[PDB]
């Protein structure tokens, strides 16, 4: 169905700075796109659902935006616990995940 | 464009489009609908159903029920039965 | 293993009725829509009918409109094609075909899986 | 406290069958549909199956269509996934994921709550 | 020859209770559900209550909810309507009506066979 | 629930003519609508049930038709005994009656 | 060897009463429900009445509602049909038909075994 | 054999209502949209109304806007045209016509098949 | 209830030739439809029940199929004893029979 | 007989909100788009807003952009115009008028049928 | 809407001759125009649809051509049964018919 | 006269369980679905739970999913709400609300009739 | 689900004039929107249900209107007992309430 | 509906060469077009679906391209097994097949 | 067991009018319920047994009705000698009495 | 048959505080569930029978409830004598007891 | 009634390996399905009843599962005495058995 791509593969940022992750879809998924955060040894956790709506318990640090085929996830001021690999899913047509973007120390 | 035609075009195709996807959508909502009507339906059929199975059901439990009331029944008739056989 | 097997073929006389059955296995039957495809030698392949996943809508070709009836039963996983008032032009091989390899909303109408086909011939 | 605990993993040989189970607690189980999500290292996450709230409809991915069977038991709050005719491509971590954080008619298909995951390996 | 006759009519003061009875003959009483229908000059026909074949379910109109009570006795072939807390708006002619001409699962809720009716007047 | 209206309030037709009685529902009732005939001092009589089906004993003179929110009852050659007030009932959602239409001599 | 023998037929005047009797043998009588079926030339086969296994429930066709009474007596393996207020439309051959071949919960209402039939003629 | 037959014609007085019916057979009725065509001698052929396949959309000619009502029922394969407030301009032969011989998405609005036509005259 | 129609009324067939019979229902019947065979002077005999299930003792010659509102009874190689009138019954909503279709010598 | 009746008029103070309703009968309401027309003495006719056949696209005039809201209910055959934050410049006669007499793709935007109009006065 | 006129009103052609029929629209109808044959006592029949395509069962003797506002219909070899009146319809904008051109024996 | 009265209110410590009960009279209790609605000052009105007429389906709000439990007993005309694992966010007045004024198939989910409300305080 | 907002927070009107309260939804709720009135110390009372239908016993003064995402509650000529808080509910998708609007003496 | 034509009818290429098969539509079919391979005695097999996407199990040797009214199928280096008749189907409007192009030995 | 409740406790009436007495049981009693009349100074007298059957010697003025959980006692034209307290008994499950209700002069 | 479970195993409640015990069933037991109290060295004492009815001599302090599969026992203001182990029994299907919940000092 | 099928007819597993057996029903069976183990010359022995419940004396090695129409029986680590033929029974509608699956040495 719809292939999901994320770029860049790895983002290097030091704590306190803003880190932006991007997600792209081959075909338009309107505004049905969820972001997940996975730490090593842990199951993915739902951060954002829809296009920008934030899951309960998630701090206002995480901010997502975009519609159609261009999606971005923005961490306003990345803390120590925000170092992980983030996956991009669209549920408009089927259920396809992105390869995943890893955020690491600088 | 404010000057676009607002009336419906009658020349549109009235036939069913066969190229519509015949596969069932996996993206339909799998969650139960809380907005369904919770009230009982007065428009249901009040008549009996002759189409129900008239045959005896062999799958009923054949074992003696232990949950039957073991206490004696005070509501049984205390009067002597006149219909008992009066002959020898 | 999407395996499609046609059956009920044979030889009939013009103006009579014939029925083809198609037993499908190897996939969730009630999730996909099926087709019937007819191959006439000297003419090629031509489409016959299509039926929805739950049997709601049925569409037939112009040449078989009103004479052929397509149906399905999701419980025994079968596709049926009732052929009433057969004519000489209806001699060909009939294939049981599935629509699409997988679900895609914007891409449907191609036959991802075909059956081996059955031969239906009418004559005197 | 939505808690999902999988089980039934282990080692299998290709061509055999494994049955995974998922225990759900902390929510009204019968009011929600459940998914299965598979994580393969080097490939990422990929969806496997989904079932309706009452188990009426079941949808499977292309790579698992016809081999995997999803089931549910609303009286025991359990989600099952029968995996027949396994292949070496099926070696990965299987997550039990609930659909949606709360009921929204226009927004469904994201995984609000995940389980810890179970490991199924297919090798000789 | 299905004949439905009612009784229990008369004149009662507002705030008092009246009981109507309806005798049914000419059909198997326990296989059908019976209605009560209200006719007021200047307002037309109005529905009041319905009872199931075995008396399991009872549904009343909004204007009579909580004040009227419908009941049936399948052993005496009688239909009853207890009318407590009567108000001046209840002056009408009350008909005993049987649901449907015959059993049709997809068509029920029309009153094929009516009774002659009784007049209930509430005034001081 | 569903508000039922009839038009016209009264009809004047000579015997042997065709009299048409119309009925309208506020919302769709599909094909669940019956017609009743009431003579002065008599209980209503079921003529047509569902949308068109005729009760046993009803002459072929009475013809009911219609679906959705537009229903009509047609009397092809009205006789002397067909002068009465006719009621329109829906039973798709609840049990409501129409105001009634009277057929009178011309 | 399920054998059904009807009796009680003959000629009666309109408005009088005739009682048909059906003797059953070759099966456990009390475990099955029995039907009465009517065959009039020019109209075809017509259903009349059905009785439950224990005689609890009785259902009748519209044309025979309130005039025909079906009954059973499990101690003699007999089926009875009491015909009151007979009319000229009631002349036919009456068949005693057992319901179903074997007990199937989801399939009941077909007549596996028919009786020889008896002729009831109504005229002057 | 696409056969269209009309009925409900006759003689009516101005200001009254007439209902025409159109029975269609030989094709999948629910998949196609139907029309009504008016033939007034001295004027030619005049289009009246068109209805969608499922009755979702209805369109009427300017001369009959607000007076004529077209309707369909797919369970009986029949087409209705309710003619209210008839005027002496409305005398003509009314034809039931199907849209297109087959489905071409860019070509629709021509009448592939016509009925024999029913004659409607309004006068005193 | 359900109006049952059979077509054609009579089919002309020779021994060894495959004969077909059609049955149609006014409304949906699903998969509850039985076929009966009546020979002159004899009570009807249950051939098929459900939609295709065959009664015990019925030769595999008789084949039924269909669901909803289209049911057919097919005789693969009609023999000499297979000449009779066949009835179509539904037991989904009520108990109604068809007019019956007679097969005769050609 | 295209009949359009306007209501909701009266006198309101500046800075408040009024609602106008326009009932339409005599034509297929859902197949046409309606307008709102303003007539001010000493200025002439002034356009207010336009709505599509289903209300998908709405266009307002500059003098009322961002303050007036147009809406429609095809199930009730009514046209609404919500005038929020009214000012002294809004006092005029408001006309509900249908677009065009009949359908013409290249000719739309002229007014065929007008309503009698309602008066809205904004003053202290 | 679009005004359709046909010229000439009547044509006189002997059997075996060719007949030319002209249809003209007030505005452009592109390539959406059908031709109809009506015989006395019969319903109109579809001969040509689109701009040139021929309906099934219609012999290749009938040939239509033209686009825009000028359309022509030609009968290459008129037979005995082709004597009738021909109507011109456009369905690009609305549904309007032409007055009709009659083919008469010469 | 429909009266809804609640009980079981009071003050509890966080992490403990409280049981609210609601008594209903003046209507056929078993024919309607009941709601629990929450009012916290500074937040507004809030929905909690709903139960079907016979208690087949129960739906809870997101904030209370997994902790609260709604039940009913049609033989005592009472509505219950088990509040397990209470937290300080649950301090509010809890109302017993009945769905709809009367039965309408396409219009349900609005609280026609409310109870007086009971106060639940969670603190130490 | 759908978040409902009401503007203005408070509206000041003296008895006798016209008072309008507005309710707006984030997503379309069609015509499923109920209004409630709550007096100090009292439970809320259902005034208007659907989009315009009035509950039994409610005076014709309270007039409801609107559909989709813009709703209004109109009071024709306010009395003294109509001073309370008015809540806006949507029941199309879930069950959410508005913050409430105060009406107070001017 | 849409008539599908191919050219040339037959192509002669020795194994290891490149063979190109062309498909042309009367009207635009956008990007909905499938290519099927049929060997004698075997049912057709789906090679390419959409306009370029390859069915699962098809080697990268087969390459489809084109859109609108001009399509082509390229076999970069045919083996012995790639010798068969190839059919071009459009499913944008209807379901029509091409006559078939055969690839044989050179 | 089964608890009986009577309402109202006392009723005020003048001789010649109709008096209604209600009895309600917690659980179903089918049709086994008796009414007793006790005057001050002597033992209660059995008026009605079963659900409606009258004891021998009881005037037809005393009328009983009801089954299941709702029972009523109705006196057609209440007289003077019969002013007393009335008791409701159930003998289907155990033997319980109602609290008793009183008829008094108005 | 039916497995009885109770949670938590032990509850710590100081005198004057409210104590709640839970009992859960694998399958529905309707309203047939009795509660017992056992002090060390003594036989269990029946507190509650049915679902909420209280045994004779039991103080109104003990208030139980629940039906179906969820049952609870509430002690309104626990005294010094209310420190014991409480057992849950169901008698709808068989006779099975719960593990028992102990109440101890805090 | 229900035709019961098992697949495969024979399974070959070495001791210590896991053996799984499948049972399929023609129609829905829900949770009423029993497994029986028969050794040569011995009567069948009840292993599983219901859908998963284990008979007394059966080791935890045997684990039944499934519901509806798909049932599986799993032997976690088969020893030497677990070589036999396993029959599958449904008692939801009638009493039907399966053909029987034999477990044999490898």
Residue numbers in the entry:
A (entry chain N), F (entry chain L), I (entry chain R), K (entry chain D), M (entry chain P), N (entry chain F), ...: 1 to 94, 96 to 107
B (entry chain I): 1 to 88
C (entry chain E), D (entry chain M), E (entry chain H), G (entry chain Q), H (entry chain C), J (entry chain A), ...: 1 to 52, 52A, 53 to 82, 82A, 82B, 82C, 83 to 100, 100A, ...
Which statements did the authors publish about this structure?
Each of the extended helices in complexes with 337, 334, 311, 356, and 239 are right-handed, while the partial, disc-like helices of 364 and 227 display left-handed curvature. Other key residues in CDRH1B are R30 and F32, which in both mAbs 239 and 356 form a signature motif R30N31F25, mutated from the germline sequence of S30S31Y25. The light chains of 239R and 356R had one and two additional mutations, respectively (239R: R56T; 356R: Q1E, R27Q). In terms of NPNA4, the apparent affinity of 311R was essentially unchanged relative to 311, while 356R and 239R were ~two-fold higher (improved) and ~two-fold lower than 356 and 239, respectively.
Many malaria vaccine candidates, like RTS,S, are based on P. falciparum circumsporozoite protein (PfCSP), which is the primary surface antigen of P. falciparum sporozoites, the stage of malaria parasites infectious to humans. In each complex, CSP displays some form of helical structure that is stabilized by homotypic interfaces between tightly packed Fabs bound along the length of the NPNA repeats.
